[PDB]
Design an enzyme around this catalytic site. Structure first.
Site, mmCIF file in Angstrom:
data_model
loop_
_atom_site.group_PDB
_atom_site.id
_atom_site.type_symbol
_atom_site.label_atom_id
_atom_site.label_comp_id
_atom_site.label_asym_id
_atom_site.label_seq_id
_atom_site.Cartn_x
_atom_site.Cartn_y
_atom_site.Cartn_z
ATOM 1 N N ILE A 54 -11.389 3.704 35.402
ATOM 2 C CA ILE A 54 -12.244 3.401 34.268
ATOM 3 C C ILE A 54 -13.697 3.055 34.612
ATOM 4 O O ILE A 54 -14.548 3.006 33.730
ATOM 5 C CB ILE A 54 -11.664 2.268 33.399
ATOM 6 N N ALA A 78 -8.358 -10.528 36.978
ATOM 7 C CA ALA A 78 -8.145 -11.955 36.575
ATOM 8 C C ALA A 78 -7.709 -12.810 37.789
ATOM 9 O O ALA A 78 -6.733 -13.509 37.719
ATOM 10 C CB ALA A 78 -7.101 -12.042 35.481
ATOM 11 N N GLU A 119 -6.855 -17.711 28.760
ATOM 12 C CA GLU A 119 -8.017 -18.398 29.230
ATOM 13 C C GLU A 119 -9.118 -18.512 28.168
ATOM 14 O O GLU A 119 -10.023 -19.273 28.364
ATOM 15 C CB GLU A 119 -8.574 -17.705 30.495
ATOM 16 N N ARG A 145 -16.718 -20.576 37.006
ATOM 17 C CA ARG A 145 -15.347 -20.166 36.770
ATOM 18 C C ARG A 145 -15.148 -19.639 35.344
ATOM 19 O O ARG A 145 -14.317 -18.749 35.141
ATOM 20 C CB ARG A 145 -14.369 -21.296 37.080
ATOM 21 N N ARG A 292 -1.607 -25.630 28.481
ATOM 22 C CA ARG A 292 -1.895 -24.312 28.003
ATOM 23 C C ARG A 292 -0.611 -23.770 27.385
ATOM 24 O O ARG A 292 0.092 -22.916 27.952
ATOM 25 C CB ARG A 292 -2.434 -23.414 29.104
#
EC number: 2.1.2.13
Lengths: 330, 330
Positions: A54, A78, A119, A145, A292
């Protein structure tokens, strides 16, 4: 239904392709630069391997968007250290190159099923991260980050805008630590497998220590790929068009553990495993976003879905397959 | 020192150009598609008008980056309704086209002075928004007003990354409601003038009502352009290289008012004005992020700067000039 998977040579590509080929009305176009992770589908009559990258290809990807009906772009870096060591490349690939693919879908009026990320919520203080209501919290610009989180979020907003203004049909999904057989390699630029469990299993396999960053008290949710892929499959099916314009967390909120506990669970399952003796002794826990947990109401509503596999069976199955397929001579 | 201002035909361009031409060692290259706002510098020996548009030109802008030493990109749409009515165009211009200019600076090793926005903090709960410590808070993806805030933030992060990885010399600045003479038009795609005071002054000028969205209790800080431009001028001077890699809020935190109070202050200054009779009667207050106060420690430290003009003198001067230059036949 022609399904275009960009970055098929991995975890999601494998499990998604298996699922769609069970059904008689899917043609899967799996785009990638290699095929080792999916080589057993290469001879399948309804799988079509497509050579591509890509970042290099323009027209070839564009073509395949036009040819197909639905598109799943799974190419992204990631890897957390990369957010700080190679931020520009994370931005270029994850944002810029995926934006081109989004615009191809807009142009040829194709449906896009896009992997957003958990995230995006950042340091959100809600106990359950809610796609439609939770505020997104990141640090200052001097905390690099967050470049990954914010790149992915802006991409969501751009998709949303194309949807509002240009009639793009989309569904966004957010996986929460999917895990099972055929995990991506830690440095593969393909979305989907829990980097936390891959790392830990790798520690046990290599005999390196398990790093508990500040005691490993930060809590995460973990999702069996059988549950995850079932949800993604339903997004593809899109019964009643109920996924149109939706953002869907896909995770199991009852599979909650701190990194410490995940550590102990893996270790217990490891020490019990019949092939454990091929691997080194345990090097030990090494002390070096606090929660999370997904809301899954959107998945309940749109997909009639809820997760069926307990923590322990997913852990055991994930570990078992990993160990069994490790090449012991290399 | 060759200073390249992209989007010179406006408020900041005018006031910055005036300031730099006072000093004997500046050559100002003012790029824009028109020159009516700065036509009195066109004959100045150290001002150089450059025809251009950052969405159309590639090579011409690139050239002028190479030719110059420092670059100030002031072209962006920051009209709130546009964030929701034309989000793609806001993204394309404010993010994509400015990113090209950033990359030209990286490539030719030029210094960039970039207007970030006070909108990056979003719904940050700190009382004083701090460039180095405050968390950035936005709403879900289904609240599209945040596309502007998040586009600008990602651009900051990309600048930051070029700085870390590629030796880009940058300073980021965040203006808080700068105001004075020669305000941008409300729909000009040029950064710098307080849209809230321009709108209100426009209400008084047109005889339309002042909208207090939910009573207008949301508080903002307002900064005289003489203070603001002094700070920006010092960033350009960069004494001791103390602005390198810095992010600097430029505002006056003591000039705090709710929209309601700003309303009443303007109205008082208006009713007292000798040219008030050229304008209609007051149509009235109409009931239809709660605080946005800058920390200015970075400006104190880097620029040795603090704001000198009180609320009332800036209000009066801003209004006075606006009224005096209104064309009463049109």
């Amino acid at each position: 239904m022609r399904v275009l998977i960009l970055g098929v040579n991995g975890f999601i590509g494998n499990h998604l392709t298996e699922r769609l080929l069970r059904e008689d009305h899917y043609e899967v176009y799996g785009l990638d630069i290699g095929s080792d992770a999916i080589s057993r589908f290469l001879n399948h009559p309804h799988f079509h391997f497509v050579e591509g990258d890509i970042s290099i290809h323009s027209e070839w990807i564009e073509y395949h968007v036009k040819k197909c009906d639905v598109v799943l772009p799974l190419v992204a870096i990631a890897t957390p250290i990369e957010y700080t060591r190679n931020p520009l490349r994370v931005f270029e690939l994850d944002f810029e190159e995926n934006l081109r693919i989004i615009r191809y879908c807009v142009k040829y009026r194709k449906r896009i099923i896009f992997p957003s990320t958990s995230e995006v919520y950042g340091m959100c203080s809600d106990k359950y991260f809610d796609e439609d209501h939770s505020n997104l919290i990141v640090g200052p610009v001097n905390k690099p980050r967050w470049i990954y989180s914010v790149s992915k979020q802006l991409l969501d907003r751009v998709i949303w805008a194309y949807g509002e203004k240009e009639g793009l049909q989309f569904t966004l999904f957010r996986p929460f630590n999917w895990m099972g057989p055929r995990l991506d390699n830690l440095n593969a630029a393909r979305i989907g497998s829990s980097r936390a469990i891959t790392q830990l299993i790798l520690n046990l396999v290599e005999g390196s220590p398990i790093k508990l960053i500040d005691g490993g008290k930060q809590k995460r949710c973990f999702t069996d790929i059988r549950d995850g892929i079932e949800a993604l499959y339903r997004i593809i099916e899109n019964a009643g068009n109920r996924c149109d314009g939706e953002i869907i967390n896909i995770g199991n909120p009852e599979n909650e553990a701190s990194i410490e506990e995940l550590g102990e669970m893996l270790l217990a399952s490891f020490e019990k495993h019949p092939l454990r003796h091929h691997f080194p002794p345990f090097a030990g826990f090494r002390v070096v976003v606090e929660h999370r947990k997904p809301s899954i109401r959107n998945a309940h509503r749109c997909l009639d879905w809820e997760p069926k596999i307990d923590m322990q069976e997913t852990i055991d199955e994930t570990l078992d397959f990993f160990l069994r397929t490790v090449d012991l001579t290399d």
